[PDB]
A paper describes a structure:
The current work describes a 5.5 Å resolution structure of the putative trans-activation state of the engineered mini-IFNλR1-[name] complex. The present cryo-EM structure of IFNλR1-mJAK1 depicts two [name] molecules symmetrically dimerized via the N lobe of the PK domain, with the TK domains interacting through their C lobes and their active sites facing one another. As in the nanobody-stabilized complex, in the nanobody-free complex, we observe a similar arrangement of both the membrane-proximal FERM-SH2-INFλR1 and the dimerized PK domain below, additionally stabilized by the V685F mutation. These two domains form a compact unit with clear density and an absence of significant interdomain flexibility. In the TK-PK pose observed in the nanobody-free mini-IFNλR1-mJAK1 complex, the β-sheet from the N lobe of the TK domain abuts the ATP-binding pocket of the PK domain, interacting with residues in both the N and C lobes of the PK domain. In the short 3–10 helix that precedes β1 in the TK domain, Arg872 (mJAK1) is within predicted salt-bridging distance to Asp675 in αD (C lobe) of the PK domain. At the TK-TK domain interface, a primarily α-helical interaction is formed. This interaction is largely composed of the helical packing contributions from αG and αEF. As in the PK-TK interface, the TK-TK interface provides little buried surface area (783 Å2, ~5% of TK surface area, per AlphaFold-guided modeling into the observed density), in line with the proposed transient nature of this interaction, which is likely necessary for [name]-mediated receptor and STAT phosphorylation. However, rudimentary modeling suggests that, in this TK-TK configuration, the tyrosine residues in the activation loop of one TK domain are capable of reaching the active site of the opposing TK domain to be phosphorylated.
JAKs are protein tyrosine kinases (PTKs) that mediate signal transduction downstream of cytokine receptors. The mammalian [name] family consists of [name], JAK2, JAK3, and TYK2, all of which associate with the membrane-proximal regions of cytokine receptors through conserved intracellular domain (ICD) motifs termed “Box1” and “Box2. Ligand-dependent dimerization of cytokine receptors is conveyed across the cell membrane to drive [name] dimerization, overcoming an autoinhibitory interaction within the [name] monomer. Dimerization of JAKs enables the trans-phosphorylation of the activation loop/segment in the tyrosine kinase domain of JAKs, which stimulates the catalytic activity of the kinase domain. [name] family members consist of a four-point-one, ezrin, radixin, moesin (FERM) domain, a Src homology 2 (SH2)-like domain, and both a pseudokinase (PK) domain and a tyrosine kinase (TK) domain.
Author numbering:
A (entry chain B): 441 to 480, 492 to 604, 613 to 734
B (entry chain A): 588 to 604, 613 to 855, 867 to 1153
C (entry chain B): 1028 to 1153
Write the structure that this text describes.
């Protein structure tokens, strides 16, 4: 790390568990040729001199050519400190957009601060008379999906409905915070949820329908016709979608080909497919 | 703490919110999970409110399938019984300030365009007493609860006069204007010591009252009558506003120097499961209307939600057949608790901590001598003889159904299977499809559904074989019959049972059974009911055994 | 199994008791001759076109009087030991009835084989 204040790094040690063996490296706020490490209850600091690209610990007559060469060397020894002794086990690394003293607070960047929803779920209900249940489409992971059509939202719009399996109503929690977490997302590469439906005991996520279908069998069918820029753009757009997802501190544990659904074909012409 | 409108409430305590704070939890009834919607938008609507006269909800709890509203606890309790208890000590400024603060709370409610369809004394909970000193009591408004829009048509008529006739005509006509009607109803209620309004009036009479467009109730004061008529308007759009009510009451309070055998589900404190059958379930409950845990433990029988109407009628029959019974060796009946809509009924018996002989005997090996279970047999014979003299056949005479009241007395229960015989027949024929103790029945009771008073002699003999052997699982008539009939299988069992019985097979001599006891005892299972003994003869023989 | 002449049931499951041979009701013993009884019941169903009015359920019920769930198999066994069987189906030929009633002999050893049934039926074709 750079010249980050002591309180920041001390707090960082608390979050992981403050177990003996961890350590954090950051540049000394006063000296350009010295790195300081904080080890950890006790919190011991240690300084290392870096001269002419050569690395060595203060009080030690030996020297090492690389910082990694230096720090790897001390991995296999015991450290004596007054009466207490310990062995380092693991380092600490930076985190995305980690708030610290080096950052500058501005009015325009304030609007981009993430919202606080640690214990909040919001969702919109869909009246049971506003939907039409259609034919089945296949059973998912403890989930059944039928054909759907929404009315009075234009009107008579085909939608996708998903029914949680009655054998697993105990997991209606994950059901709820999965239906809720998609309310906050807003990107062209993500599905659109009109809301949730309530009747009797079962429930439905009314999601966007796309005729393109999943890319799995699509790619399975015309492999010989595929091109290289095709997969380049396919990868880059889903990578951008994942960057958007991580930009809102949200997790998607099902990043797979089965969760990649095509929108447009574009194979025949210069236009690119959409997923 | 007591059952609400399809809701159960237990004691609660929240941790790591200070810590170790007592809270109030409310559990929606599993029989009505279909109404989890109104549940949800009732739990949500209280998130937006913020006033000192309203409850505080810490949130909602999730686990398995059930859910809980964690609400604020107050030791003051509801104002209903509070006002009931010290009516003679009440004062006029007391009710003035009580009315004005709840009116201010209702104005706050209408200021946020929210509806509360349960403005009643039962939803008024006290916070501080203040009677002794100049400080005034504090009350706070509770949750709206289940909406009336889902109540039955019958359930829409018991809320009279608290319910507005507009919602009665159509539930869709609900609006904030109906809150003033409940407000005026409560105003009248607090003016007469909380007396039940429109009591001694049938449902049809209340409907006639609404349709006749007559005044529901009148006070004895001119100004009170004026203000009530001003707030008791059949036109919802003509009802004046709350701030007008506050100004009127503030004017008048200075203008007037002169001051002038049923059980409630809310008082049923369930403790622990007492007994579950194929169609019904018995719970252990404490009836504590005072809320001080000084109530009386009672045994309550209930039916599972998926029970049919035929089983409902069977249960009702159970009530009336037991109601006219009165004997020292039978379960005691006290009253009946009604559920909302008339679709549910609770049967209340006596809870005996001694339990039944099935459980009492195994834990009491050495303290019963032969004389004691001989007395028990005398008691059971007397109970059946009383029942037979009333032309009833219990049809479920089992030691598990023989409740114990003391080490000198037992009682008989589980009368859900008891049937009366008509005045011009010698037996009864069963029609209902229900599991039955086939091992406790006489051969005719297995072959032709024919049940006599001599049939209960067979059941008594089985129960005595149970009793003298101290109700041993090792010697259970279930297992004894099973082993004497070989490996049998469910539907198969009764067949081979009949086969062996026609072969002259019976239960063996119980351990250490005296020869005279065995002789009189085997007399009970003669094949022909006409050749079977009577319970008067059994009592005579047993008492001779005492001599 | 390779060294037995029948089978004994242990699992607790609802079973078509009206379709079973007397040993299948009394001792859980199920033979290949046991399926001859079931075939005869099914043929009584088939020739009568599977009539609800002539259902073996209802036919047996009415020949055994008013019975009741757990009670039914008892009286069923009683009547069967009395020599009672399902009646002649409507318009059933005399030879068809003769070969057909052969299926419900009380002793499984005295019950016919399905090869014999096929032979008799094909002779009926001729
Ligand atoms: N008054 C009572 N006191 C104590 N236990 C009771 C009482 N009434 C019923 N029970 C318990 O309920 C269980 C079942 O009761 P019973 O009415 O015999 O059968 P069912 O299961 O049909 O209700 C028994 O084990 C008995 O211990
Ligand atoms: N979220 C979805 N959007 C569009 N189509 C879907 C979705 N989930 C499943 N399908 C359709 O279901 C079928 C396979 O599950 C395919 O026709 C696929 O297009
Ligand atoms: N919301 C509530 N806050 C405080 N006490 C309550 C509440 N609901 C019920 N109770 C208590 O339950 C009992 C009667 O239901 C009384 O002791 C009453 O105080």
């Amino acid at each position: 790390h750079g010249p980050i204040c002591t309180e920041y790094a001390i707090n960082k040690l608390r979050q992981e568990g403050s177990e003996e063996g961890m350590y954090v490296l950051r540049w000394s706020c006063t000296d350009f040729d010295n790195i300081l490490m904080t080890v950890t209850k006790q919190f011991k600091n240690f300084q290392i001199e870096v001269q002419k690209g050569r690395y060595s610990l203060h009080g030690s007559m030996d020297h090492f050519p690389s910082l990694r060469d230096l720090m790897n060397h001390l991995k296999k020894q015991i450290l004596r400190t007054d009466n207490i002794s310990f062995v380092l086990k693991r380092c600490c690394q930076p985190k995305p957009r980690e708030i610290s003293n080096l950052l500058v607070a501005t009015k325009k960047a304030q609007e981009w601060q993430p919202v606080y929803s640690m214990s909040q779920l919001s969702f919109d209900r869909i009246l049971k008379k506003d939907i039409i249940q259609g034919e089945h489409l296949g059973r998912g992971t403890r989930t059944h999906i039928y054909s759907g059509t929404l009315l009075d939202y234009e009107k008579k719009i085909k939608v996708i409905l998903k029914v949680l399996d009655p054998s697993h109503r105990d997991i209606s929690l994950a059901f709820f915070e999965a239906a809720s977490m998609m309310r906050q997302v807003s990107h062209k590469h993500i599905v659109y949820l009109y809301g949730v439906c309530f009747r009797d005991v079962e429930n439905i996520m009314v999601e966007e329908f796309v005729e393109g279908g999943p890319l799995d069998l699509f790619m399975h069918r015309k492999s010989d016709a595929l091109t290289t820029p095709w997969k380049f753009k396919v990868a880059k757009q889903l990578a951008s979608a994942l960057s958007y997802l991580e930009d809102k501190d949200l997790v998607h544990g099902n990043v797979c080909t089965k969760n990649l659904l095509l929108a447009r074909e574009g194979i025949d012409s210069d236009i690119g497919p959409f997923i | 703490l007591g059952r609400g409108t399809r809701t159960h409430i237990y004691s609660g305590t929240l941790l790591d919110y200070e810590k170790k704070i007592k809270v109030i939890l409310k559990v929606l009834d599993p029989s009505h999970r279909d109404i989890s919607l109104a549940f949800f938008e009732a739990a949500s609507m209280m998130r937006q409110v913020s006033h000192k006269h309203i409850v505080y909800l810490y949130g909602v709890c999730f686990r398995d399938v059930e859910n809980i509203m964690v609400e604020e606890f107050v030791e003051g309790g509801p104002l209903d019984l509070f006002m009931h208890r010290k009516s003679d000590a009440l004062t006029t400024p007391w009710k003035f300030k009580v009315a004005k603060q709840l009116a201010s709370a209702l104005s706050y409610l209408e200021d946020k365009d929210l509806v509360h369809g349960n403005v009643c004394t039962k939803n008024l909970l006290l916070a501080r007493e203040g009677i002794d000193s100049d400080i005034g009591p504090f009350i706070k408004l509770s949750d709206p609860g289940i909406p009336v829009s889902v109540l039955t048509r019958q359930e829409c008529i018991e809320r009279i006069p608290w319910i507005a006739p507009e919602c009665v005509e159509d539930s869709k006509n609900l609006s904030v204007a109906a809150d003033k009607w409940s407000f005026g109803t409560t105003l009248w209620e607090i003016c007469y010591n909380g007396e039940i309004p429109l009591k001694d009036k049938t449902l049809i009479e209340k409907e006639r009252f609404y349709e006749s467009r007559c005044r529901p109730v009148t006070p004895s004061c001119k100004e009170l009558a004026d203000l009530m008529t001003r707030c008791m308007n059949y036109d919802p759009n003509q009802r004046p506003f709350f701030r007008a009510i506050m100004r009127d009451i503030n004017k008048l309070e200075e203008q007037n120097p002169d001051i002038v055998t049923h059980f409630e589900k809310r008082f049923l404190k369930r403790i622990r499961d007492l007994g579950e059958g194929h169609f019904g379930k018995v719970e252990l409950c404490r009836y504590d209307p005072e809320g001080d845990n000084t109530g009386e433990q009672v045994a309550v029988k209930s039916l599972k939600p998926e029970s049919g109407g035929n089983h409902i009628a069977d249960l009702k029959k159970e009530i009336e057949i037991l109601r006219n019974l009165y004997h020292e060796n039978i379960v005691k009946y006290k009253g009946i608790c009604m559920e909302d809509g008339g679709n549910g009924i609770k049967l209340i018996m006596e809870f005996l901590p001694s339990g039944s002989l099935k459980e009492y005997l195994p834990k009491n090996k050495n303290k019963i001598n032969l004389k004691q279970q001989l007395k028990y047999a005398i008691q059971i014979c007397k109970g059946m003889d009383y029942l037979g003299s009333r032309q009833y056949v219990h049809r479920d005479l089992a030691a598990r159904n023989v409740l114990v009241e003391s080490e000198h007395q037992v009682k008989i229960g589980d009368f859900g299977l008891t049937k009366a015989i008509e005045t011009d027949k010698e037996y009864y024929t069963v029609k209902d499809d229900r599991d039955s103790p086939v091992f406790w029945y006489a051969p005719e009771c297995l072959i032709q559904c024919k049940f006599y008073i001599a049939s209960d002699v067979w059941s008594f003999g089985v129960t005595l074989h149970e009793l003298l052997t101290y109700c041993d699982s090792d010697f259970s008539p279930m297992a004894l019959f099973l082993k004497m009939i070989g490996p049998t299988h469910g539907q198969m069992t009764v067949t081979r049972l009949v086969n062996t019985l026609k072969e002259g097979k019976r239960l063996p001599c119980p351990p250490n059974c005296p020869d005279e006891v065995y002789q009189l005892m085997r007399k009970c299972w003669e094949f022909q009911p006409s050749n079977r003994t009577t319970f008067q003869n059994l009592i005579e023989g047993f008492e001779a055994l005492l001599k």
